[PDB]
Symmetry: D4
């Protein structure tokens, strides 16, 4: 089980990048909306009662959701910085620069897909079905690259 928490409905586009990946691997997950600032009790309640092995927090601006989620559990918390101002430099450092003792796994700005893959790599350590799918997923990717090469090769001759 993977729990995806959006600090705002504005993070839906990035959150769906994650969901579409999780749906392709056939894994269980939940998608929630909860503000660390506006509804601290909803976040707390979602986290403390979740059965998720991995949390994916998605927020922009002075993104404090990832940090708040991590302070409520010892499960791995992945943060996805969303660019809503200053081209994502706010949400990036606001979530990556956590203090000693309470870490947060940070991925690139708007990288919901990489957040889902990271979460699957963590689960794959216990679920061999997921590990196998990860290897196949990489193969699929090499193949798209070969196809790009083949196509471009026919371009400027």
């Amino acid at each position: 089980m993977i729990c995806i928490i959006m600090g705002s409905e504005s993070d839906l586009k990035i959150a769906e990048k994650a969901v579409n990946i999780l749906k392709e691997f056939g894994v269980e997950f939940e998608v929630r909306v909860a503000s660390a600032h506006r509804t601290p009790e909803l976040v707390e309640e979602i986290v403390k009662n979740s059965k998720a092995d991995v949390f994916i927090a998605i927020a922009g601006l002075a993104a404090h959701l990832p940090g708040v989620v991590a302070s409520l559990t010892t499960k791995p918390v992945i943060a996805v910085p969303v660019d809503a101002k200053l081209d994502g430099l706010d949400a990036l450092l606001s979530s990556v620069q956590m203090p000693p003792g309470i870490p947060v796994a940070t991925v690139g700005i708007d990288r919901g897909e990489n957040a889902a893959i990271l979460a699957l790599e963590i689960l794959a350590l216990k679920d061999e079905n997921i590990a196998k799918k990860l290897i196949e997923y990489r193969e699929k990717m090499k193949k798209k690259v070969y196809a790009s090469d083949e196509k471009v090769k026919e371009m400027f001759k």
Copy 2:
């Protein structure tokens, strides 16, 4: 009453800048240490039971203390970004870029003194003794500037 909360004992130097100002104006205040990440329940407990009209939160790195304090009260929360990495650019945006609805008054990096003055200006709206002291404080400052001018004037002639 003014409540000063440090996210870490590393913020003491900046926190004392604030205290020394509050001591010169003869006003009531409290100085506490509480981590938004490590001890969310201590922060919550300090804020929800404080009698302070103004909160001064001082933290560095991915400073989330100011934000967490503001989400627990409707009283004015002043944040003081502390430079512990990336010359304070982290704690700055992490506290200033709050989301709509839950604001935080931000002052310059390591500006504990300006945080105390801002807090006094807020109290002065209800305490005429403080308002008077603020005006006198400004006069004192102009005088130090005149003295600098007088001194420099005698320098390169």
Copy 3:
């Protein structure tokens, strides 16, 4: 009474975010346009004769309005950095990095709404009607978040 001063008519969009909030709380306020550079005497005149307990200064670029307003009064001065160039990094530091003795409460870039809320939180210390409205305002916000959660919950099942 709250006094909103725009350094330019270009700041109207951000200034209206503030006004709409003040109108919802039913509080007195004034909206003015005055340049710190082009009309220093109008700014001076507006500030020195205002009956406002809180000043909200809104300017972009090398925003010096907040600083100039604060140097003319001991009342709390809230600055709203407007992004007109360099994605608001100019107006941000130009108003937040004030020197010791003359502080300015800074909120996020284009955050006129947060500027109005901050101003109300200050007034609420003396006006219980405003304090009550602030608490209700927060409740309203939690409710919009719950509604977002409920809606998103029905999305990917």
Copy 4:
């Protein structure tokens, strides 16, 4: 098993922060030095034959080690940006901004301790002994904070 790889012996100080944490939890680990640029075959060889469930890559400058390690395994790869120039802004984005499909869990600059904790949180999903230790570790941390509060409380009275 956790595999720590340093791109340079210059990363030892940060690498030891990690080791000291792993030693306190009594977990198996390896510490290696391998350059992604100078010895790509050593990195490849270390990764492809490691029995580690989690990789911790530590490099500075145009840090490409984390990325190269992640491209060689599907196991979680944690990157620790080291500040050797431009106050760590190079190694930060160079490792965090990975492309879709090949993610890297990034922690703060020089945060070797947070890298080890993150790795343990991942292992804890399969090792209950580690999960228990994580909870105890957090308790220990709250206690240091309470002690800081108690101490500071006796300071300005």
Copy 5:
């Protein structure tokens, strides 16, 4: 022979800027697509067997292609940072800040044309036909500038 390698088909626009220059000088070249992260074996294979005297690597984000290409050959490797996020500041430092011993010639962001010219200047050291064309190319450029001057001169009179 010059070998142009794109880390992604998204770099085609910038890659064509290079090709169009190489086509005007009548020199041999190859255009390939290969990901340093997704297909490390294709990159390795392309580089180790290329007969190119100069390599032009074009990638965005945490661009690691230039670095990986340079670690596989002693031939000059020119990197072209592509702006796909953070206005190209990622790919810039990620390729320019190489470590001692394995250098990479970096040109401006999206400067595929300057990458091709740089490559020709290198070849010109051995091919006098190219050296001559470079001098003629510069003359052509001065002429476009004179024409701009002549045109603008007739503008505001």
Copy 6:
């Protein structure tokens, strides 16, 4: 006489901002196009033979025109950084950070109008007709501000 030099015809929009100001003050000026990189001999020739008391150089990217112009004369050289990449941060520092001995007066990015005004303020020191016009120009500006205030005043009542 004022000499405006554009490093590229791409700087025309910003250059016209300057011209329109100079035309309103009725002063003599020249508008030229010359590249510091592509046509160093045209720049040299224009500068060494100009009768201008003030030079206005307008260039973007790694703007070296201002610097090159200043190294060819002892007359005041005003630089106007043009944002063509990295939101003007390149051309800004590339022209402002001159080395001791050869200064360049720098104005804001794309501020051709401020460049013309600065040039007129310099000429006004010798031409009383220009000095008078500068004072009138400022009056005109205060008046536009008063009109903005009057208009906005009628807005939210």
Copy 7:
């Protein structure tokens, strides 16, 4: 006459760089200390009654002195950003990014010497004795460079 105004006695080191240059050219000047924030009436008074043809304002942090000085006169105002925080990026943009109509000539951070030279180049337009000295000053500089070349030439042979 040239008027140098320091916003703080902390700017003395940079201010002396300017004075030493002015003393070598044998020109009249004044050195003053006046805060735009703390003593707006002293700044106003100094500027409105100065007989200076050129003003050199030196301030750090959210440097507003240059802007305030320029709003009080039509004489050329040169700003010298002082690095007291964020390596001078605050004072730089805070003074360079002036709004249309009220320009400020900006030189590099801590470049008091370049500020004095710029001021002399302006005066030289009316004082031929200064113009001559500027040309001689440049000759002296070329000579120090030749001497560096001669010395280095004997170094690695």
Copy 8:
């Protein structure tokens, strides 16, 4: 032949990093000092008469030396940004962001060693003795890495 040009004697430390590399490969080279701003005629004269196949320009601040050198020759010009202010961000973009047609090969800040290696890789295309030495140089480097690994391996057991 390789020509190293320093814009200032302040660049000696970085320039020697280059020389020491060139001395180890036993190749011909010259070390000169010439300012693009202060002595444009010395730079011009050095470049136009040099027999060097590769130019290495080393300058800090608003580094314009690399650009000026490249505008005087069609030979490859390598720039080494020197950090003398703003941690090298000035000299970096000032030399890397060249305009179309006149490229400059840029290496990391203070990377004189990488500048020399890049220059040798260019010469190696015509000198097989240098090509061979480059391959040996890389072997030597792998060996230092293996030695670091061996040493660290014995450290925490």
